Subunit: 111 residues, 2 copies
């Protein structure tokens, strides 16, 4: 009911996946020795569609603290050394059946 | 040709996305002040399907260094304090048209 279906380690995409993983494990790992798979205890897979949102947005620093109300519409800093406008690029990954979002990518260039 | 289609900031899922993002921006940010969107310069979206692989795997530390050949089939450490078997869970996100993989999740419990 909804979850990942089993797949044979024999399967092409699974070998690719498993090779990739062990690969990253070794690259990241700090061992001078190479590790490799003894045995795959379980391999499953899930086709999963989601929407990516790409938003390019200018943010302004408002005059309200995070610990106060109305934040939605309160006014931007006009004092000279207090103001900051940043320009940001956000990538958001949305799985709509699940109602969840993740910030995949985030840069603010700030100016 | 292949890339993200424009979407109206008026659109429901986009407001959700933009609110989510600014939200995370503030949570992560170190400012005592709240930032909010001045203007959204550009908003696009892409429906994108990929396969998730979930692999549960026991890894063994082999006797070969990373800087030598045959690593695919070379033998595990048998000396007592040199051997390590770990048991790992890897989540791999594959976009097959693009031929790319990402390690989304990775834990080795080590024993």
């Amino acid at each position: 009911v909804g979850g990942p279906m089993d797949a044979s380690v024999e399967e092409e995409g699974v070998r690719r996946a498993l090779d990739f993983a062990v690969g990253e494990y070794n690259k990241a790992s700090n061992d001078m020795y190479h590790s490799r798979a003894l045995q795959v205890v379980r391999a499953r897979k899930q086709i999963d569609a989601g929407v990516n949102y790409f938003l390019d947005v200018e943010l302004g620093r408002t005059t309200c603290t995070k610990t106060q109300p109305n934040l939605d519409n309160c006014p931007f800093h006009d004092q000279p050394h207090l103001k900051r406008k940043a320009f940001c690029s956000f990538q958001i990954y949305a799985v709509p059946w699940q109602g969840t979002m993740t910030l995949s990518k985030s840069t603010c260039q700030d100016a």
